[PDB]
Design a protein around this ligand. Sequence first.
Ligand SMILES: [Au+]
Ligand SMILES: [Au+]
Ligand SMILES: [Au+]
Ligand SMILES: [Au+]
Ligand SMILES: [Au+]
Ligand SMILES: [Au+]
Ligand SMILES: [Au+]
Ligand SMILES: [Au+]
Ligand SMILES: [Au+]
Ligand SMILES: [Au+]
Ligand SMILES: [Au+]
Ligand SMILES: [Au+]
Ligand SMILES: [Au+]
Ligand SMILES: [Au+]
Ligand SMILES: [Au+]
Ligand SMILES: [Au+]
Ligand SMILES: [Au+]
Ligand SMILES: [Au+]
Ligand SMILES: [Au+]
Ligand SMILES: [Au+]
Ligand SMILES: [Au+]
Ligand SMILES: [Au+]
Ligand SMILES: [Au+]
Ligand SMILES: [Au+]
Ligand SMILES: [Au+]
Ligand SMILES: [Au+]
Ligand SMILES: [Au+]
Ligand SMILES: [Au+]
Ligand SMILES: [Au+]
Ligand SMILES: [Au+]
Ligand SMILES: [Au+]
Ligand SMILES: [Au+]
Ligand SMILES: [Au+]
Ligand SMILES: [Au+]
Ligand SMILES: [Au+]
Ligand SMILES: [Au+]
Ligand SMILES: [Au+]
Ligand SMILES: [Au+]
Ligand SMILES: [Au+]
Ligand SMILES: [Au+]
Lengths: 169, 169, 169, 169
Amino acid sequence: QIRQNYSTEVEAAVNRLVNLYLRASYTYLSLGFYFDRDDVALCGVCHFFCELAEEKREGAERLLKMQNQRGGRALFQDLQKPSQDEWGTTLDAMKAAIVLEKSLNQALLDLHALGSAQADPHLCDFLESHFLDEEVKLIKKMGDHLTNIQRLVGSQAGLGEYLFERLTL
Amino acid sequence: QIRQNYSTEVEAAVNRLVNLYLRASYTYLSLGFYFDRDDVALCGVCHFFCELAEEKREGAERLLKMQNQRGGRALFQDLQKPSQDEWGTTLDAMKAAIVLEKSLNQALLDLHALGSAQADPHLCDFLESHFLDEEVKLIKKMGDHLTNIQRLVGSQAGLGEYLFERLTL
Amino acid sequence: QIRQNYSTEVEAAVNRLVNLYLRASYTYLSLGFYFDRDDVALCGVCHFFCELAEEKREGAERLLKMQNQRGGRALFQDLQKPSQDEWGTTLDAMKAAIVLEKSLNQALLDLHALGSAQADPHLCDFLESHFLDEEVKLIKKMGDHLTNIQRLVGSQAGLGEYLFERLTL
Amino acid sequence: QIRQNYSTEVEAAVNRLVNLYLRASYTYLSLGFYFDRDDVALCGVCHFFCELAEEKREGAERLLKMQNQRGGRALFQDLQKPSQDEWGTTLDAMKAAIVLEKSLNQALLDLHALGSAQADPHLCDFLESHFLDEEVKLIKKMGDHLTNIQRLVGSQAGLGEYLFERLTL
Ligand SMILES: [Au+]
Ligand SMILES: [Au+]
Ligand SMILES: [Au+]
Ligand SMILES: [Au+]
Ligand SMILES: [Au+]
Ligand SMILES: [Au+]
Ligand SMILES: [Au+]
Ligand SMILES: [Au+]
Ligand SMILES: [Au+]
Ligand SMILES: [Au+]
Ligand SMILES: [Au+]
Ligand SMILES: [Au+]
Ligand SMILES: [Au+]
Ligand SMILES: [Au+]
Ligand SMILES: [Au+]
Ligand SMILES: [Au+]
Ligand SMILES: [Au+]
Ligand SMILES: [Au+]
Ligand SMILES: [Au+]
Ligand SMILES: [Au+]
Ligand SMILES: [Au+]
Ligand SMILES: [Au+]
Ligand SMILES: [Au+]
Ligand SMILES: [Au+]
Ligand SMILES: [Au+]
Ligand SMILES: [Au+]
Ligand SMILES: [Au+]
Ligand SMILES: [Au+]
Ligand SMILES: [Au+]
Ligand SMILES: [Au+]
Ligand SMILES: [Au+]
Ligand SMILES: [Au+]
Ligand SMILES: [Au+]
Ligand SMILES: [Au+]
Ligand SMILES: [Au+]
Ligand SMILES: [Au+]
Ligand SMILES: [Au+]
Ligand SMILES: [Au+]
Ligand SMILES: [Au+]
Ligand SMILES: [Au+]
């Protein structure tokens, strides 16, 4: 028995956070392939979301690895399908991405608060080292992208959307 | 005692010019971080101003080194905070930069005139070699940037501001 | 809007800590050039303080970068001139440096305490990763230097001050 | 006839400055060999003065080359023997060196003033580029050395003189 100072509440919440990361991954997969549609055709947007799908999956895998290291038991649930089948414009897609990220970030912070109430400093090191800083960086990048996309809407929206994909993504 | 042909008036004016260079450096620091804001998000503008902050600091350090070489005494004053907290558009920011540069250039020229009236040819060599030519080059570059920014304003200002940052900076 | 779990109190305190780092940087600049005076002439002491000026500036820049990442707004104040124009002996200068460092360290710890009361684990990761350990290391080094400088004072102070600069710095 | 805008007064003064540089060179030669005496035996001091002898000779040669370039006629006088046969301590020797340098520097400045009164901008470029900055640097270095030598005198003069030669020169 390896398990030590690892509460059942943390264990459960780690499994939920794994589910949220895989759901996010799945969302990004759907975002990526939407932008690869012949009638959408924004290669850079596709590559941005595909890369995020992978990062989110890796996140989940690190949580699972940590679950096992602490002697908790990974439990998997259904992955709920993404919230939309079609994601609109690059602007709409980037808004939906940042609301998704803010929800993951909130779940990370709820998990940190739970680890403080439970006195679980390994969990706290774990989240700090691999999640908190990265999520903040990602959200700042998405904010930056959103400000440039918005700046490019104005009167010529198609033009702005093309330029952004070519010169930023 | 090393001091030779170095007037108290030059000495004072060198300390003031050091203060002006560090103030300029501090202005550029504030300009750079304004453009790094998530709601401004113009990476190239940030990098242009950050680089200038550093060049201005180096300027100040060279003046200090020269002060010591002539046997004057460096005296430091408060660095006054930059003239604005938010710098508006890239156009506004580049105008404010060039007025700042013109003020440094005028201070350089007042110092040269003072060195001529005092018969201080080392000071004159010093300013010529490291300051006068560089300030002229920088101001010409900023003028060029300002003309391209203005050319890009027209009807689609957001578009122009994005393009300038991507294709020039 | 990227800002999430980032209090106005943390935001303010980050801006103040930036000011303290830049002030420290400016102090070290003045310490460095004092030791470069022809009538002081302690090259190693100059290089030690110059390097510190740079580290302190970098500190400030990292805080600013973090401010932007969390969606706070950087606000700059006057940089107050250093507490002295002439810094006495290497011993006096190293004492003044360590009191300065202890004040920065205290400000770092007040900021950590504020981040705990506000439940801001990103801020806590941030300070731990880049500031707390480094400040402790620096202070230990300065303590070591101070003990060797003091050991060298005794009867022949000029000799001790020369040796320290040649064989340690 | 190449000569253009080159006064007879500048020409004469260039020949005198050549004589001063060669005299200085000769002084340094004598300083160097004094420190190589078996009863003085300060290798680093010898190497410092030997190097200066060479720099001063090079100075003279550059002046001669410039004399010819402007179509003036080099005229050589006796080189007066150095002011002393024995140079005392490293402290005494470094004082005598800096008075010598200050005299060369004054002659450089008198020549610049003469070139301004004569409207001879080539002469002014010439002195600025190769002489003024270098003489200031050298004098600052000698001042630094003098401050460290003085710091090392105190009670144990022999010790201080040995250490300076080993750890600085
Ligand atoms: Au894709
Ligand atoms: Au793709
Ligand atoms: Au993909
Ligand atoms: Au935590
Ligand atoms: Au904890
Ligand atoms: Au914690
Ligand atoms: Au913790
Ligand atoms: Au984004
Ligand atoms: Au995006
Ligand atoms: Au990107
Ligand atoms: Au920047
Ligand atoms: Au930047
Ligand atoms: Au920067
Ligand atoms: Au001048
Ligand atoms: Au002049
Ligand atoms: Au001049
Ligand atoms: Au001149
Ligand atoms: Au510019
Ligand atoms: Au510009
Ligand atoms: Au540029
Ligand atoms: Au320094
Ligand atoms: Au230095
Ligand atoms: Au420095
Ligand atoms: Au904390
Ligand atoms: Au905390
Ligand atoms: Au904490
Ligand atoms: Au913590
Ligand atoms: Au220290
Ligand atoms: Au020290
Ligand atoms: Au050290
Ligand atoms: Au020699
Ligand atoms: Au020698
Ligand atoms: Au020799
Ligand atoms: Au001249
Ligand atoms: Au002239
Ligand atoms: Au001149
Ligand atoms: Au001139
Ligand atoms: Au010397
Ligand atoms: Au010397
Ligand atoms: Au030397």
